[PDB]
Design a protein around this nucleic acid. Structure first.
Length: 256
DNA sequence: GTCGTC
DNA sequence: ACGGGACGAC
């Protein structure tokens, strides 16, 4: 874990919530005929509400969510993941997605992305960017679009809240993030010709020919990511392994 | 709680 | 065919 110490700012664990400082706040273009839609918030049980509350509060403290009055409104859903009885906020942005202008999907499919890994580079590092979408600011003009209602019995919010960052459930988030990070890591690729860097939204794979080149490469990548404002999961990081898990594949001896 | 789909 | 009903997707 000497890496955790050498790169404080790069790990989600010690660098705090990220923010892509080099990326201009995103403006989300609407379809030519779109008009705001305000969907009714169906009553939520106290159990769900209590489970969600801490997440909402944390996001408010972090500034990711802010109060607002908007012509738009979509449902907030209480979702117990892994069948487990733990609730987390899930916004139904389907009506918003329908009204936002489409963009060409530029994220490669994992199968094709992996085809770009030579047998020569067998030293790997896998990094997962934490709260990736949240690292990208949303332009003030586009924020109203993702509003939802938030109710709390004692001293909280009085109406709607919305995101100041690219949100979950928005049809174009994966693509916009992949493109933004590609722009931010363009220079790194240029400064490290001998390194292979695969990008799949927030799932990164760095490939080197030698253990040391992977150590040096990994150090530089972590340094760059931290400086750019992104955060990698230290808990999940797979640093300089000749065998790693990436996008559902088990990379070993140049296999898969 | 909806809602598109195999 | 044509449509009630499981999956999972937001």
């Amino acid at each position: 874990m000497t890496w955790l110490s050498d790169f404080p700012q790069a790990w989600a664990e010690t660098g705090g919530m990220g923010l892509a400082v080099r990326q201009a706040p995103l403006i989300i273009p609407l379809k030519a005929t779109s008009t705001p839609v305000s969907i009714k918030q169906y009553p939520m049980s106290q159990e769900a509400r209590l489970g969600i509350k801490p997440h909402i509060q944390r996001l408010l403290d972090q500034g990711i969510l802010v109060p607002c009055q908007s012509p738009w409104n979509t449902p907030l859903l209480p979702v117990k993941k892994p069948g487990t009885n733990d609730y987390r906020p899930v916004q139904d942005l389907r009506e918003v997605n329908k009204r936002v202008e489409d963009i060409h999907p530029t994220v490669p499919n994992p199968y094709n992305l992996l085809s770009g890994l030579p047998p020569s580079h067998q030293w790997y590092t896998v990094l997962d960017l934490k709260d990736a979408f949240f690292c990208l600011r949303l332009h003030p003009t586009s924020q109203p679009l993702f509003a939802f209602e938030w109710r709390d019995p004692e001293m909280g919010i009085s109406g709607q809240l919305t995101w100041t960052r690219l949100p979950q459930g928005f049809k174009n988030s994966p693509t916009l993030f992949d493109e933004a990070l590609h722009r931010d890591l363009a220079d790194f690729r240029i400064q490290h010709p001998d390194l292979i860097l695969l990008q799949y939204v927030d799932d990164l794979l760095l490939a080197a020919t030698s253990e040391l080149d992977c150590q040096q490469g990994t150090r530089a990548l972590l340094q760059t990511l931290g400086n750019l404002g992104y955060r990698a999961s230290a808990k999940k990081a797979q640093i300089c392994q000749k065998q790693v898990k990436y996008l559902g594949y088990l990379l070993k001896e140049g296999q898969r």
